[PDB]
Ligand binder design. Sequence first.
Ligand SMILES: *[C@@H]1O[C@H](CO)[C@@H](O[C@@H]2O[C@H](CO)[C@@H](O[C@@H]3O[C@H](CO[C@H]4O[C@H](CO[C@H]5O[C@H](CO)[C@@H](O)[C@H](O)[C@@H]5O)[C@@H](O)[C@H](O[C@H]5O[C@H](CO)[C@@H](O)[C@H](O)[C@@H]5O)[C@@H]4O)[C@@H](O)[C@H](O[C@H]4O[C@H](CO)[C@@H](O)[C@H](O)[C@@H]4O[C@H]4O[C@H](CO)[C@@H](O)[C@H](O)[C@@H]4O)[C@@H]3O)[C@H](O)[C@H]2NC(C)=O)[C@H](O)[C@H]1NC(C)=O
Ligand SMILES: *[C@@H]1O[C@H](CO)[C@@H](O)[C@H](O)[C@H]1NC(C)=O
Ligand SMILES: OC[C@H]1O[C@@H](O)[C@H](O)[C@@H](O)[C@@H]1O
Length: 711
Amino acid sequence: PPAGTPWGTAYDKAKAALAKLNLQDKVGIVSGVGWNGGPCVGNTSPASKISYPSLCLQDGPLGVRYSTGSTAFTPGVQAASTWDVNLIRERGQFIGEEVKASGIHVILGPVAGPLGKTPQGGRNWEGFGVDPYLTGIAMGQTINGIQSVGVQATAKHYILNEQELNRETISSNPDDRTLHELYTWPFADAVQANVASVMCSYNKVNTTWACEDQYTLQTVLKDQLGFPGYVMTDWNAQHTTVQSANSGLDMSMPGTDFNGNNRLWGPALTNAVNSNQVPTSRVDDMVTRILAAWYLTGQDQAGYPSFNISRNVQGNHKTNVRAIARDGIVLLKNDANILPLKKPASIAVVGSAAIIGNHARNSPSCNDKGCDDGALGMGWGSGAVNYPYFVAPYDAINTRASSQGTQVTLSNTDNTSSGASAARGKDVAIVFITADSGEGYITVEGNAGDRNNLDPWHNGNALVQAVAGANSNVIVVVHSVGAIILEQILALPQVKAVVWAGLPSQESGNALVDVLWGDVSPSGKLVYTIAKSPNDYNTRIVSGGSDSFSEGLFIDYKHFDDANITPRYEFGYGLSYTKFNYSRLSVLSTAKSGPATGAVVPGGPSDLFQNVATVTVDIANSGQVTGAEVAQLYITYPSSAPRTPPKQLRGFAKLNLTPGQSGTATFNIRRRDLSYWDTASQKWVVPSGSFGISVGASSRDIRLTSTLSVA
Ligand SMILES: *[C@@H]1O[C@H](CO)[C@@H](O[C@@H]2O[C@H](CO)[C@@H](O[C@@H]3O[C@H](CO[C@H]4O[C@H](CO[C@H]5O[C@H](CO)[C@@H](O)[C@H](O)[C@@H]5O)[C@@H](O)[C@H](O[C@H]5O[C@H](CO)[C@@H](O)[C@H](O)[C@@H]5O)[C@@H]4O)[C@@H](O)[C@H](O[C@H]4O[C@H](CO)[C@@H](O)[C@H](O)[C@@H]4O[C@H]4O[C@H](CO)[C@@H](O)[C@H](O)[C@@H]4O)[C@@H]3O)[C@H](O)[C@H]2NC(C)=O)[C@H](O)[C@H]1NC(C)=O
Ligand SMILES: *[C@@H]1O[C@H](CO)[C@@H](O)[C@H](O)[C@H]1NC(C)=O
Ligand SMILES: OC[C@H]1O[C@@H](O)[C@H](O)[C@@H](O)[C@@H]1O
């Protein structure tokens, strides 16, 4: 790592601190005390000689876990659905503040793995959607936000943990280009934003456990992407004392298995070094990397608060949760201006997802959010936290509707008769369906982490059907961990509006009325494809020992485009209460063909992240109300290049505009954004020829097109 740069400075302090330490101090730095051995989710032994504390590591990606005075931030997937980097950075900042104040050094997040290739994947919601570019930017933005507050971030999970089923035994075996150009891409962005830490995943990669694999840890992440920080195991994801240490692993978390066995480091590592099974330079390096993180985030300095998880650290962070839950809502359908609602006489609200249930209550049965009872705000597993409060859709609708004279009828179960009765007669009927998933150690309603199917939960399809048979103007509201097939719902001519609310967390109700009554126009867009049929997707949750990743670069919309399948709603699709005009598309480039030539800095060869071209378009609010548009750039590579997905998202801007108001969206093209991983030459290459430039409101709603040349 070069000097003058943040990492370089930290390594100097890290090398200097290493001198004062014995082997006993070193292995205590790298060895977890055990499963629940300390007061945090993770803990290591302190080194008092350098005033290095017992390192406190905690879940997770959306806030402080097991805390009684904490904010439950929206899942990453909601943040990405805003398409708003400012809200994304803020979210990471706000998480970081609560982590410092609660006395935790390392937050175990955010998530780039799984990327999310299979809609049934139980953990995708924790991430940033299916596109490596968007997810990449969001990793960058989030990590800056988190670490600028003085807390350590963890890029997670490295790598290819794209399903929950047999995650601890299944092998992920993609070809080299798929590995570099798709799944690693977002991880580069993380390394480049100077991420403190990287978590290696539970799965195997080409038959080798991820936390024991020389090639992914050493050659690719550490060497090729120039990651100066440290790699920790997922909880009990280490299988060896010796092999893991030599491969590139830096930290054994949490130290033991749940029963307190399989202690492969610590005393065993003290043995291994003595026999020179593990050299000394290797153990020095781990401790270097670990301490350099502690120095990068300035956690040595001043009075870092002590671990107190009952501290009220919320503040006014709910504003970020409000904004993201609200601006992350996608409007899928809206016929005959049914929406926004403008003071109707009566409203029917139908569904168990409409009201407070066990999920929103932090119920003792519903541990780790391991249930889909009542209103839904997130998935389950390690990436869930407790709700400090929860605003149920019904309650927020009730207050607002009542205030303006509207009467409300509630049918708060999923019963079809009650649903239809409540609907019949009323001016509109709003019905609430869900779908849930999570980490694959909790089975909820038969779903062992990953979803069994892509249908609504609790017979949501029948409920919509029942209500539609009793009312002409139906609004369907979905809160979901991922794509749900919507063809049955859409077949009902009575269904006039669908609202893809996503995962809103604690501010569910408010965000929704924000959009429903049109205090804000919806501006969210999809970060994954909603298909007409489950069959149209090209990936499966794999039940055998191996996923060959043979689909390669072609996942979600890249498959849909290439095979010419028409989705119901495409990636980057989203409606608005107003509309927008695109004009004056311009393209400027100085990009040159050939391999990346810069030396390796955090993120890879130095030129890869530097801008080489710029694309411009003017967006004008041609509607009658204020609203934000997410203008998107898609790139088609030249015909000289190998088989590459036809369109590839390479930029996005969001512009908020009053009626008649115009603005310029600017897309900065980094070198990588025109590159592909040439496997033969083992380098990132920009191809020569003519690139296609597609600019529009989605991956499919292209409005203007042009070209970009390479010599
Ligand atoms: C899981 O396993 C898979 C499968 O192994 C992993 O992918 C593999 O990753 C490694 C890197 O670790 C790559 O190795 C590199 O290979 C290139 C050459 O690549 C070409 O040949 C490949 C093998 O071809 C054999 O088989 C064909 C028939 O199929 C026969 O005709 C041949 O005779 C061979 O027997 C072939 O697989 C490649 O095709 C792939 O890529 C092309 C596009 O390039 C696609 O069209 C295909 O679809 C396909 O995916 C390809 O044609 C070597 O050049 C590399 O060695 C160089 O670089 C090293 C590092 O710098 C260095 O040590 C060497 O010295 C060497 O450098 C030499 O060359 C330089 C540049 O030319 C010179 O500058 C220098 O002077 C020197 O002379 C390297 O060995 C594999 O290609 C790759 N395989 C695939 C299929 O992708 C995957 O990573 C694993 N996944 C995990 C762990 O998650
Ligand atoms: C933890 O925080 C609470 C504030 O609610 C305080 O009463 C208590 O003293 C703190 N305990 C420790 C050990 O810091
Ligand atoms: O709770 C600590 C860890 O638990 C594991 O089961 C999960 O896979 C990780 O995402 C999490 O960080």
